[PDB]
């Protein structure tokens, strides 16, 4: 999967967003076991606090959009993050929820990535959990050339393989 779809790396700084805490924590544990590096947000990127993210979301890395996150929140966060220069790779985790259905979220993410001027400067990785409900989403990711993985630990392992190779 990685050799087929992932864009070559220009660095080793990682950013993570999720619609839940525990998957992000599992990702962090896997990253720690392999001596990886987390990215640090800049003060100016605090446009996130203003940009319609509700007041109860804490602005840091990993960025935990809560269980009730909607697709619009994803799109706004993606735009703001892509217009910055604070990281070299971006991990996007999605868990099953009523507010953000899998197929629609995948479609909006694909379009947002397609239309962004600075998309070709970073490497995207997706991890959509839930075997039954994410089949069509994974198929759509495949046709657009974006890599996708089954579990967060696998995603971290795939990223660190290329980091170590370089």
């Amino acid at each position: 999967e990685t050799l087929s779809h992932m864009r070559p790396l220009r660095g080793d700084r990682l950013m993570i967003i999720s619609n839940g805490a525990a998957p992000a924590a599992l990702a962090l544990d896997a990253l720690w076991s392999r001596n990886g590096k987390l990215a640090t947000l800049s003060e100016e990127t605090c446009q996130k606090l203003r940009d319609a993210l509700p007041e109860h979301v804490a602005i840091s890395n990993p960025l935990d959009l809560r269980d009730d996150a909607s697709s619009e929140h994803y799109i706004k966060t993606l735009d703001i993050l892509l217009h910055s220069q604070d990281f070299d790779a971006l991990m996007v985790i999605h868990s099953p929820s009523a507010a953000a259905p899998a197929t629609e979220s995948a479609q909006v993410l694909i379009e947002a990535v397609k239309h962004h001027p600075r998309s070709k400067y970073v490497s995207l990785l997706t991890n959509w959990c839930g075997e039954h409900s994410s089949q069509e989403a994974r198929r759509l990711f495949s046709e657009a050339g974006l890599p996708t993985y089954r579990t967060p630990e696998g995603t971290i392992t795939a990223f660190m393989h290329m980091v170590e190779y370089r």
Partner: peptide, 15 residues
Amino acid sequence: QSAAVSNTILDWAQQ
């Protein structure tokens, strides 16, 4: 003790 893990496991069982 986590809602996201619960939903994930339920989906896996459904598969």
